[PDB]
């Protein structure tokens with residue numbers, strides 16, 4: 236069902252270093268209705284390779300995008316963390332590049348349309364592109380125009396014809412989800428005018444390696460990206476990386492701005508600073524990735540033993556959150572419903588379902604509060620600050636959290652952190 240990678244998406248070479256292999260794993264966003272057996276549950280090979288030319292890190296395989304995205308889970312809410320970051324994206328894009336009010340912003344992977352809504356509140360014209368039909372119907376209903384398609388060279392031409400030249404094209408946590416990134420670059424090139432920008436937000440490979448964030452490896456995530464590999468791609472499509480901002484969101488990310496090579500946007504010094512930093516931290520050396528793989532085996536082992544040791548002492552453990560990355564973590568660690576009795580999640584879509592592979596039940600936060608849990612394994616650790624800030628009562632009662640990265644730890648710690 237899932238097609239194997241041959242050549243590299245970004246630079247086109249074929250010199251792959253193997254880094255880690257988790258074997259066959261079910262899809263992280265395929266939540267299941269509870270049942271007696273789960274024998275026909277699909278699994279796909281989940282393994283990562285590193286390109287020695289440009290140092291894109293890629294999965295060995297590409298699960299069909301039609302299967303992944305045509306019906307996708309979503310929330311109707313949005314946390315305060317998410318809202319604030321979306322406001323920040325607007326501020327950066329508009330203030331750093333002087334985008335006037337009334338300008339046109341096109342967003343790829345626009346989802347329910349809240350990021351575009353933010354742009355509209357700042358006086359912009361918008362349009363979204365997202366293949367999730369269920370989610371696009373919601374955006375459209377709310378008043379956020381969204382084409383229910385994948386982004387392509389042809390869709391790009393349709394947009395230009397009917398909607399004109401965008402001053403900004405935005406893709407947040409979608410660029411790493413697309414196999415044919417050459418085609419994205421080409422459709423972008425055709426959309427961009429002389430001063431237009433293409434901006435993408437993706438998890439940063441430097442942070443992913445240094446903080447041992449192996450749970451962000453899942454089938455939707457085809458690519459794990461540094462600035463180097465983006466320059467290698469965009470070189471070959473008349474595009475130039477002109478600016479980068481590092482961000483704490485999603486365990487360390489980069490928001491990368493790209494313009495036409497012959498356009499009016501000058502390259503800022505930070506671009507080369509980050510490429511020099513990637514060298515200096517060893518992204519172009521085989522040892523670094525063997526070290527990453529070493530860390531993964533070590534963290535995986537001590538996380539399971541910590542959990543099983545506390546259960547042997549008669550402590551009750553649950554998962555806090557049921558995000559996609561939590562399902563990589565739990566499957567790789569081999570944890571079952573005997574290890575975690577449930578995972579609480581605020582998404583109603585997920586409540587009453589069961590997780591892929593491990594089949595742990597997903598329950599509401601209001602059920603979770605009735606139960607005497609001793610430890611929550613914090614699966615949604617990227618929202619650690621927002622979560623801990625509202626869990627005073629649990630913490631005051633002696634409840635604890637287990638954080639999986641950079642190394643497994645226990646919150647609260649034994650002394651004031653300073």
Ligand SMILES: C[S@@+](CC[C@H](N)C(=O)[O-])C[C@H]1O[C@@H](n2cnc3c(N)ncnc32)[C@H](O)[C@@H]1O
Pocket residue numbers: 300304307343344345346364365366367370384385386406407408409412413
């Ligand atoms: C993880 S989400 C990101 C949602 C939102 N941008 C955010 O940052 O929260 C991935 C989204 O991109 C959409 N998507 C996946 N492949 C796409 C493609 N080739 N073109 C446009 N959208 C795509 C999915 O339907 C999904 O809504």
Ligand SMILES: [Zn+2]
Pocket residue numbers: 243244245246247248286287288289290291
């Ligand atoms: Zn490459």
